[PDB]
Write an enzyme that holds these catalytic residues in place. Structure first.
Site, PDB file in Angstrom:
ATOM      1  N   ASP A 156       0.981  -1.027   0.025  1.00  0.00           N
ATOM      2  CA  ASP A 156       0.119  -0.004  -0.033  1.00  0.00           C
ATOM      3  C   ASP A 156       0.985   1.225  -0.087  1.00  0.00           C
ATOM      4  O   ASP A 156       0.463   2.273  -0.526  1.00  0.00           O
ATOM      5  CB  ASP A 156      -1.036  -0.056   1.289  1.00  0.00           C
ATOM      6  CG  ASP A 156      -2.153  -1.030   1.060  1.00  0.00           C
ATOM      7  OD1 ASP A 156      -2.594  -1.220  -0.152  1.00  0.00           O
ATOM      8  OD2 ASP A 156      -2.554  -1.634   1.965  1.00  0.00           O
ATOM      9  N   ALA A 197      -7.222   2.265   7.865  1.00  0.00           N
ATOM     10  CA  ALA A 197      -5.828   2.399   8.113  1.00  0.00           C
ATOM     11  C   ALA A 197      -5.346   3.372   9.576  1.00  0.00           C
ATOM     12  O   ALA A 197      -6.149   2.639  10.419  1.00  0.00           O
ATOM     13  CB  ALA A 197      -5.151   3.519   6.940  1.00  0.00           C
ATOM     14  N   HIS A 203       1.942   9.295   3.414  1.00  0.00           N
ATOM     15  CA  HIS A 203       3.321   9.048   3.917  1.00  0.00           C
ATOM     16  C   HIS A 203       4.055  10.281   4.281  1.00  0.00           C
ATOM     17  O   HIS A 203       4.746   9.996   4.967  1.00  0.00           O
ATOM     18  CB  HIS A 203       3.848   8.198   3.134  1.00  0.00           C
ATOM     19  CG  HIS A 203       5.456   7.792   3.478  1.00  0.00           C
ATOM     20  ND1 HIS A 203       5.608   7.083   4.731  1.00  0.00           N
ATOM     21  CD2 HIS A 203       6.454   8.094   2.852  1.00  0.00           C
ATOM     22  CE1 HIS A 203       7.056   6.957   4.721  1.00  0.00           C
ATOM     23  NE2 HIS A 203       7.610   7.546   3.583  1.00  0.00           N
TER      24      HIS A 203
HETATM   25  N1  LIG Z   1       4.203   2.141  11.009  1.00  0.00           N
HETATM   26  C1  LIG Z   1       2.979   2.236  10.983  1.00  0.00           C
HETATM   27  C2  LIG Z   1       2.155   2.496   9.575  1.00  0.00           C
HETATM   28  C3  LIG Z   1       2.288   1.190   8.770  1.00  0.00           C
HETATM   29  O1  LIG Z   1       2.987   0.280   9.219  1.00  0.00           O
HETATM   30  N2  LIG Z   1       1.613   1.332   7.584  1.00  0.00           N
HETATM   31  C4  LIG Z   1       1.579   0.335   6.572  1.00  0.00           C
HETATM   32  C5  LIG Z   1       0.470  -0.719   6.873  1.00  0.00           C
HETATM   33  O2  LIG Z   1      -0.807  -0.255   6.770  1.00  0.00           O
HETATM   34  C6  LIG Z   1      -1.460  -0.912   5.856  1.00  0.00           C
HETATM   35  N3  LIG Z   1      -2.423   0.235   5.272  1.00  0.00           N
HETATM   36  C7  LIG Z   1      -2.071   1.334   4.467  1.00  0.00           C
HETATM   37  C8  LIG Z   1      -0.825   1.785   4.174  1.00  0.00           C
HETATM   38  C9  LIG Z   1       0.368   2.306   4.338  1.00  0.00           C
HETATM   39  C10 LIG Z   1       1.490   2.826   3.872  1.00  0.00           C
HETATM   40  N4  LIG Z   1       2.147   3.598   5.082  1.00  0.00           N
HETATM   41  C11 LIG Z   1       3.615   3.463   5.234  1.00  0.00           C
HETATM   42  C12 LIG Z   1       4.330   4.274   4.295  1.00  0.00           C
HETATM   43  O3  LIG Z   1       3.793   4.762   3.223  1.00  0.00           O
HETATM   44  O4  LIG Z   1       5.709   4.195   4.691  1.00  0.00           O
HETATM   45  C13 LIG Z   1       1.676   4.919   5.442  1.00  0.00           C
HETATM   46  C14 LIG Z   1       0.257   4.782   6.195  1.00  0.00           C
HETATM   47  O5  LIG Z   1       0.419   4.181   7.434  1.00  0.00           O
HETATM   48  C15 LIG Z   1      -0.802   4.486   8.281  1.00  0.00           C
HETATM   49  N5  LIG Z   1      -0.213   4.434   9.653  1.00  0.00           N
HETATM   50  C16 LIG Z   1       0.299   5.448  10.198  1.00  0.00           C
HETATM   51  N6  LIG Z   1       0.754   5.403  11.507  1.00  0.00           N
HETATM   52  C17 LIG Z   1      -0.153   4.225  11.989  1.00  0.00           C
HETATM   53  C18 LIG Z   1      -0.654   3.775  13.080  1.00  0.00           C
HETATM   54  N7  LIG Z   1      -0.048   3.954  14.248  1.00  0.00           N
HETATM   55  N8  LIG Z   1      -1.456   2.734  12.862  1.00  0.00           N
HETATM   56  C19 LIG Z   1      -1.901   2.202  11.826  1.00  0.00           C
HETATM   57  N9  LIG Z   1      -1.812   2.724  10.688  1.00  0.00           N
HETATM   58  C20 LIG Z   1      -0.822   3.892  10.722  1.00  0.00           C
HETATM   59  C21 LIG Z   1      -1.227   5.822   7.617  1.00  0.00           C
HETATM   60  O6  LIG Z   1      -2.626   5.500   7.284  1.00  0.00           O
HETATM   61  C22 LIG Z   1      -0.466   6.209   6.544  1.00  0.00           C
HETATM   62  O7  LIG Z   1      -1.134   6.590   5.469  1.00  0.00           O
HETATM   63  N10 LIG Z   1      -3.396   2.013   3.837  1.00  0.00           N
HETATM   64  C23 LIG Z   1      -4.194   1.067   4.316  1.00  0.00           C
HETATM   65  C24 LIG Z   1      -5.657   1.310   4.341  1.00  0.00           C
HETATM   66  N11 LIG Z   1      -6.099   2.213   3.407  1.00  0.00           N
HETATM   67  N12 LIG Z   1      -6.471   0.112   4.657  1.00  0.00           N
HETATM   68  C25 LIG Z   1      -5.822  -0.622   5.576  1.00  0.00           C
HETATM   69  N13 LIG Z   1      -4.565  -0.961   5.588  1.00  0.00           N
HETATM   70  C26 LIG Z   1      -3.803   0.035   5.160  1.00  0.00           C
HETATM   71  C27 LIG Z   1      -0.430  -1.464   4.740  1.00  0.00           C
HETATM   72  O8  LIG Z   1      -0.979  -2.366   3.923  1.00  0.00           O
HETATM   73  C28 LIG Z   1       0.659  -1.843   5.949  1.00  0.00           C
HETATM   74  O9  LIG Z   1      -0.045  -2.957   6.494  1.00  0.00           O
END
Ligand SMILES: NCCC(=O)NC[C@H]1O[C@@H](n2c(C#CCN(CC(=O)O)C[C@H]3O[C@@H](n4cnc5c(N)ncnc54)[C@H](O)[C@@H]3O)nc3c(N)ncnc32)[C@H](O)[C@@H]1O
Ligand SMILES: NCCC(=O)NC[C@H]1O[C@@H](n2c(C#CCN(CC(=O)O)C[C@H]3O[C@@H](n4cnc5c(N)ncnc54)[C@H](O)[C@@H]3O)nc3c(N)ncnc32)[C@H](O)[C@@H]1O
Ligand SMILES: NCCC(=O)NC[C@H]1O[C@@H](n2c(C#CCN(CC(=O)O)C[C@H]3O[C@@H](n4cnc5c(N)ncnc54)[C@H](O)[C@@H]3O)nc3c(N)ncnc32)[C@H](O)[C@@H]1O
Ligand SMILES: NCCC(=O)NC[C@H]1O[C@@H](n2c(C#CCN(CC(=O)O)C[C@H]3O[C@@H](n4cnc5c(N)ncnc54)[C@H](O)[C@@H]3O)nc3c(N)ncnc32)[C@H](O)[C@@H]1O
Lengths: 262, 262, 262, 262
Positions: free
Chosen positions: A45, A160, A221
């Site tokens: 993603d 997310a 991001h």
């Molecule tokens: N380090 C914690 C953040 C992380 O691991 N993010 C990646 C994971 O999240 C999944 N994901 C993404 C994605 C992505 C790429 N991300 C990384 C990058 O681009 O480098 C950026 C996104 O990160 C989210 N994020 C940030 N902090 C977070 C937190 N504390 N808890 C939950 N999400 C968090 C934000 O929303 C940001 O947009 N979009 C969706 C979606 N629409 N539906 C369901 N799953 C989704 C993806 O498949 C991975 O499993």
């Protein structure tokens, strides 16, 4: 037609990209990463989000497709083993397009203006010190927020960051944005609504500084420290992201597959 | 035109009702509680809910108005001191109508069918023993829920039971329903989504029994034990409730006044 | 005996400090901010926390007292109007001491070691990028945490950051620490416990880096970026903070007064 | 010594019980279900809870052991394949006993008194209508609770109903009880603490009726409608449950195995 392919950059995604390009070479498809009409993202993603932001100025001319090389990505909803089937179906075309809503973020300064588009969310935190903003909804002062920060999510973003903050999961046919709190303080003198808030199109949510005017603002991001901020305005964008769809993969089934079992 | 007035029944609400009837007598207004066109509720939100259910078969012919005799009611958004001003404005008419969405609940049995309309929500709990249902969304098995129960809320209901269950507050211009969990069990063998779910029009959410087929089903204030249940189906109703509006009282201001400060 | 007084520094707190010093001058009390036996904090809880950290190397020789010049502070539980009564009671002594538990934080590096004491909590976040740590409890790998960060709270800290994160409020006679999550990600591949965890004395909770070894570590108000971190260890300290108590103000009454009504 | 064995009653648990009895017959072990010193439960946690309540008047003379025939039970922490090893180790004895705290519930009536002991929790709900109680902590009025109900949990109960209600998980060496809310209503006129509360030994929590005096009170699996209730009092019991332990199975590892992965 014109297409391009982005890759996460590991050996596995680069090889899949090269093989799809080779397969497209057997059709009337031209590789063009300046004015593509199809943008294929191979990775996760994060890769898909970078593809969206690479082409956010031609969103109405582009249909996006995601292939997930790791476990199921929420936007990247093709497996690598299905790449050849995807080459063939894209080549013929006649596919249907599906549109998801986007979030518009406007950042105003003192003595210009910047706008950003988000596919997942935009968040605001302080630049180090306490975070205090006044939340104004359609010019009506709603609350003074004290806490770690705030998150404004699109519908497809609701699975997310929004989800980890306790937000509701919303079907992407709903044109809305959703505001969630990060660790609000609530005692007998400080008070917030607590609950996530869901806003329709044409509603404007404005965050206004109380003391400090420096904020860390994320859009998907990307995270930038903004100084001398006068206002941060959120509204549902008029612009939409378009996906090429070749088979039924309902949103609620995608939710089931990502969080319940698969 | 034709109107009627319901009262919570305490001395204060009965007297206000009698005085409004006397004031209406000075206009071309006829008291008719069989085919009213205006239904005035004097009391609290419980009083307003009873008024809505008293006339739910003529919703398209009726505009509702609520007067709150205690602290601010969410549907009853006139103060008693403004009753005379309200008599005068109603008498002339020319007011604008505002519509909120409703929830349709269908209960199917074995060897007929009952439907109900909700302004706040419908909930399901077991009849005493463990509560286990399969949650099916548009004919797709989504999860097996184990826990205390489930709550399906309208938009204007999102500030009611839904809010206490952790649901999002949704603007009532959004035609949607919202499903929240009551104390789900989650371990490595039992798994639910956890998050509230927000569904658009035409999506159907079906609860299907796993073992026990007896359930306690509430619709707004009404709670009935249903036996031999085969299915409980939720969808956004095609029917809407109409309010008479005489001045601006935005939903988000109403939320602020009820939960933040006033 | 020997005493000192810290002030928040606004005109109101400085004047109260000067008047108390003048009142103490009428008794056998010596102002000494090197080796005080009584430390009086005039301001808010932030002021009280700075006083505690100013003297954290002589905690067993000191009894603390807080005066709140704004609304009720949780540690600063005397009103300014009662300052003279407090001067008189302190002067005679014979007061009883009450002790609250503290949190010990050890930060280990690669190719020394730093320890810190917390009265409210210690938290850990990443230095900008994704936050991923392995959580090890008494040498047993418990979970891999992915999210915004983690918060480890003392009992008296449970009404502070811990509370906003969904933690339980714990009576300070319980010698324990409490670990809460900040926005954990949970899907079918990433999994945390979710729930706050409460640990007794002698249990050790260790956070170990997975990829990035740089972390932003807070202890009460202080926040420092630590580089080349090998481990962060949490345990209930053997050291305790002592308060001078002159009248009954039970913890649960203090909780009621701060969050319910006063 | 004297022992007895309870079974969940399915074919698999009865056969395991018969085989263990046969194995015990090869030692100086006497089957006695009147005055056992060892109580073996074969089934699930429900089976274990029934065993505890079958012998709650001889808790100080009994060590309990649980065998789980389904997936891992939290109290029943032996697999059926290890039954022979368990027969042999029990026969020799020399095992160590581990003790968990219990919850005492006192129910007072108008014009006697009933006490109950809980291993998981005791909960209170209304008998159908609205649930409103005053929460009094050590004779101090703390809050007026309006909502679905309240849950008071032991430490080992914190992974059960308490967990689904948002409570903290507490190590069972901590002598405490934990109070969690079920769907409290919070607006500008109704106010509760929200957060779970953790109480030490000798603290008394009293629920007192406001209007309705009929309540549905659960203690572990048992649920009884109580009428004419004047007060419900919660405190940590002086009594404890004792487990026979033959190997290390730490609580936090048991938590990991039940909720994270196994
Ligand atoms: N380090 C914690 C953040 C992380 O691991 N993010 C990646 C994971 O999240 C999944 N994901 C993404 C994605 C992505 C790429 N991300 C990384 C990058 O681009 O480098 C950026 C996104 O990160 C989210 N994020 C940030 N902090 C977070 C937190 N504390 N808890 C939950 N999400 C968090 C934000 O929303 C940001 O947009 N979009 C969706 C979606 N629409 N539906 C369901 N799953 C989704 C993806 O498949 C991975 O499993
Ligand atoms: N005994 C607990 C329930 C209770 O005290 N309810 C009355 C209070 O709720 C307010 N209220 C109502 C209302 C009403 C009348 N109610 C009483 C009657 O008709 O007898 C029935 C409704 O009760 C709600 N409810 C049930 N259990 C609840 C719980 N655990 N937590 C929160 N709400 C709960 C359900 O949603 C049900 O529809 N609708 C809304 C609304 N749309 N927006 C904001 N406030 C609203 C009303 O002004 C009172 O302040
Ligand atoms: N900017 C948000 C943080 C904030 O406004 N903090 C001050 C308020 O919190 C109250 N407070 C304090 C205090 C204090 C001084 N604080 C400021 C300073 O020293 O500069 C540092 C502390 O801040 C807390 N904190 C940080 N982020 C938070 C968040 N997102 N939500 C909630 N608390 C948060 C941490 O725990 C930290 O230790 N200790 C307690 C206590 N044990 N029991 C109950 N109330 C308490 C105090 O009376 C003010 O009402
Ligand atoms: N129908 C919903 C309830 C349910 O399925 N309960 C059984 C499951 O819970 C596990 N369990 C038990 C147990 C047990 C036997 N139970 C059944 C019986 O005796 O008939 C009674 C207990 O039920 C709990 N309970 C009730 N409503 C609940 C809800 N909404 N959410 C979560 N728990 C709920 C209460 O706490 C009650 O004491 N004790 C613990 C423990 N200390 N640590 C971790 N797991 C534990 C057990 O292994 C099953 O996986």
């Amino acid at each position: 037609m014109k297409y391009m392919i982005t890759s996460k950059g590991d050996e596995k995604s680069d090889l899949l990209r090269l093989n799809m390009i080779a397969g497209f070479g057997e059709y009337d498809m031209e590789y063009d990463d300046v004015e593509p009409e199809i943008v294929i993202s191979i990775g996760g993603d994060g890769t898909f989000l970078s593809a969206f932001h690479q082409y956010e100025e031609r969103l109405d001319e582009i249909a996006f497709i995601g292939i997930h090389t790791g476990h199921l990505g929420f936007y990247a909803d093709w497996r690598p083993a299905e790449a050849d089937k995807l080459v063939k179906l894209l080549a013929k075309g006649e596919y249907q397009k599906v549109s998801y809503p986007l979030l518009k973020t406007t950042v105003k300064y003192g003595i210009k203006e910047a706008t950003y588009l988000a596919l997942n969310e935009s968040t605001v935190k302080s630049s180090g010190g306490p975070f205090v903003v006044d939340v104004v909804i359609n010019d009506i002062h709603f609350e003074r927020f004290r806490g770690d920060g705030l998150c404004m999510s699109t519908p497809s973003g609701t699975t997310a960051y929004n989800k980890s903050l306790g937000g509701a999961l919303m079907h992407p046919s709903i044109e809305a944005m959703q505001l969630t709190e990060m660790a609000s303080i609530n005692n007998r003198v400080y008070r917030t609504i607590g609950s996530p808030l869901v806003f329709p199109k044409h509603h404007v949510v404005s965050l206004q500084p109380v003391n400090d005017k420096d904020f860390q603002i994320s859009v998907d991001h990307l995270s930038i420290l903004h100084r001398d901020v006068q206002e941060i305005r959120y509204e549902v964008s008029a612009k939409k992201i378009h996906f090429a769809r070749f088979r039924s993969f309902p949103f609620w089934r995608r939710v089931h597959d990502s969080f319940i079992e698969d």
